[model samples]
Target: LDNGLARTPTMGWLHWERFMCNLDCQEEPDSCISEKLFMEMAELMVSEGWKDAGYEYLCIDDCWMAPQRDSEGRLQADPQRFPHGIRQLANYVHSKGLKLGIYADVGNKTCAGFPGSFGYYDIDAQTFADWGVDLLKFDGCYCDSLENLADGYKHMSLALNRTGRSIVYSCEWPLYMWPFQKPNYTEIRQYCNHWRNFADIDDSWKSIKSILDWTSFNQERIVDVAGPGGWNDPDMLVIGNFGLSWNQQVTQMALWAIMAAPLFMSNDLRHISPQAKALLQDKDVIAINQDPLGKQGYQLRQGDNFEVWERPLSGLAWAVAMINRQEIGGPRSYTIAVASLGKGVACNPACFITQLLPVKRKLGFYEWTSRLRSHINPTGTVLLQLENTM
Candidate 1:
């Protein structure tokens, strides 16, 4: 039953073969995440309050299929990797109260040389439906021509529709695919429910900086594209994943929420640290993302490594994020007066305040610190809910 509002920003993991293989055995491509392991993660999510927080959709990345499709054009799962079959795996995940997502490339081959969806759109879509797939991430690979890229995406969308199963379609159309000069982000987002607009995102100060830079320019473009059927995506959240210190991770989660990006977590659920879990599983911030107003934020104030953004909610409540942009912290404080939101009024005169957990400080008169706390990661962020005063 369509989990109304997608509880908990849709947190879960993506099996990047390189990392998982490094931890286990490198030779077994299909065994990247053993059935034994997936169940373990489901249990972890339940225990850590993920189910309670509305977290669902445990996803799988590329290389899970055999190297070649059968002569009949059927893509085959690598038996050595997933012995129980894909359908069985989906059933297991469903039993855990989580949905299943898988990846494929629109080109002739996936980045890691697995059988891709390329010319096999109908067959692949059918296969996914048979497997009870709830989400599909169609990537762009092996296509040199721009026309071919458009064809690949359109073809898959058509195929998915024909299956009669409502699956969340995620397109990984890189920034280059954007006909930015012609201004077609509106059309592009309408063609698919969600599309990846960035390359790779990791838990680092640089990653946060990259998201802000890329999104600030194009976020408003989404207003023309967003609706109940779909959304404009900024890619996944790298919070609680490797290659980051504690502070960087917190900032990553906070910023993604404020930006209204899909909060698809990539960290291993079972082994995540407590601090990471808290930040990743934050319901207060998650509520901002799943806010029924469905507004996307834009930059209202900017500094070198500091910025403030705002998203308006239904009740004249504005969701604001104040972020530290540096790797190390300092006085990067700011305030949002009603005028900045196009209201043309003072904040104190008409707005009630809300600071998210773990960063709960009183809303100061003008300086952020009085109402906010110092950022753990210089690039970290704090979210606030501002309501219009009577």
Candidate 2:
């Protein structure tokens, strides 16, 4: 029972079509990621301890390739947009010790009409491998026939296997298919390394609320499927991006960390403010996701005002979360029994609370200074993670 955490919990962007317009208009002010801007982000990640924290993988979501395939039926990166071609870019990313990831659909064309990887599994896989691609985010769009979605993925999986490339496979089917069901996790695990277990995530408060709603609904079920070589992805982190207050973004990161979800970043890293950067690079919260014990937390109690969840970590350590959901209220307190730690000896609940995000800031981007205060509104959550204290 070696429940160690993930060594390479990813943190990178997903450039959807909506943000592409800004990239096209040279509106660097609001775009999520563009080929020109991605390199800038790559540099920041390298400079900001991505290599040290074991955070790697810079992914391009969709629309980077042409909508139509070449005359030879091969998917092509838009020459005008990707002047250096994806392979050259991948080589650059590799030079920085980071992995390069890309997106493709299982249908004839992607949702945005880009060339999908459906019929061209072998060639596409070969092309991606040749280009030094290290991760593949396989989406499910134009899935008019639900029956073939799995088969389409399997075909690509075979192609990926044949090429001897260990690209992490991420399936992006919508939830109507219930792909994360108990039985399906076993099957999906055999082929995929991770999967989108939730709905789309936008850069707004509503998106965070929706993500929390889905997390509460599926918390227990998703944990059953999480382990090494496979993970339950709850989409990328929009923490450092726009449309979220600092407190809201912290809550988002805390919840996902306790959930043991892969930490993929979906924001423009280069220009993010220092405050935003702190949230993105919070090591305490990140340690939970990287805890090596891949077990995800399960909600133990849910109340209108507060909720309690706990996750088992490597050895006898445990991570607990005491969240205040009241949006417009003063300080509130909730207690989780130390005995709730189940069959562990030397489990100090107080010690666990100390590991939480300080109400204060400390050392160089790594200290505690915020006053330990209580909530005054909704969505105030406190994450208490326990390590070797067990």
Candidate 3:
């Protein structure tokens, strides 16, 4: 309801991708959704520089609550797993200078068939607020029909507002019906800070590419609607998870940053690889994503198993990523002429360029006539930030 809170795309850690609805605590206690797991993740975020890098929320995706409400018609955390309750967990997350996020569905059951907020919007909203919830990801699971979809989400949005607690509203309304059915973007934007616009992302390069294709194909229709308070979410980041190579990770990071999407990492924070952590913490990439302009980037050109994307940043600066989408043997060279980037005035005499990932280096200034050549690895990206210097 507080759209002002997530003006910039939210950055946080979500548990869906890495630890799905693994409700069997007795068999896999460490990876299950329990109070212990959240606490450990909070500790990692604090100690591993993630908290300082702007990753401030610890989100529990699903299966966090009991199958039914208690006698007073209030949501209940799983007794055996979260013995101390959600409020205490919220306090721990807050103590670490971070916020807490939780999930619910608009239908009678969630995606995993757990109790949802269908007819209990008011009670559920107030309960979440009382438990110190800072973000609410309202999913659309069993609800059918567009009217029900709109009503359910709108009802929850109003309920959250009534609580008087600042909860960032994340809606999954459009993601369920768009492309197949017409989505009322204007109406949806009125109540949600951000809404999922594509399919849920899986931990694989193919899945990442699918999301990219869908987003790019629909950019013209949705890009302009995204800005400071409202965003077109392409789902969470799968950088640190399995089923993706390092090059693929670079591709995911570069593309997500360019799109100005929410940077929610669905990977385990405590045991994340060093390279993955570096990519996630890359200051230059994060800066481009969080740029005050809040403009969603778009594809500049695509061919030869390569594509170029650009995001306009503040101060006339720009972030460009040339991606090699092929699964080839060796690195391939790709070149882009500066004249294509902007009018003659933008890069006239010269412009300074800095390579952002794989390696960070100043490439010096170059005239508009000069071509930028980079040997990009297979499925990797050459990310650069161009600064107008004359």
Candidate number achieving the greatest lDDT relative to the actual structure? 3
Comparing 2 with 3 on TM-score, the higher-scoring candidate is 3
Model 1 lDDT-worst window of ten = 1-10
Model 3, range 1-390, lDDT digits (tens) per residue? 245778899999999988998988788988988899999999999999998898987898989888778999888998988999999999989998999999999987899988877779988999999999999999998876777878999999998989998998888989877656878787888899999988888989989999998888887878888888888889998888787999899999988999999989999887789989999999888998999898888988888999989888888888889888889679999988987874344566678889997788888787878888888999898889888865
Each prediction's TM-score versus the true structure: 0.86, 0.86, 0.97
238-309: candidate 2 lDDT, tens digit per residue = 876677776678778777887778777776655678876776677777777777767777777787677776
- Candidate 3 whole-model C-alpha lDDT, 0 to 1: 0.87
Ordered from best to worst lDDT, the candidate numbers read 3, 2, 1
How much does candidate 1 score in TM-score? 0.86
Indicate the residue-level lDDT of 240 in model 3.
Answer: 86
Segments of candidate 3 deviating more than 4 angstroms: 342-345
Task: Give the worst 10-residue stretch by lDDT in candidate 2.
Answer: 363-372
lDDT tens per residue, model 1, 232-297: 566666666567666566556666766666667666665667777777767777777777766666
Candidate order (TM-score)? 3, 2, 1
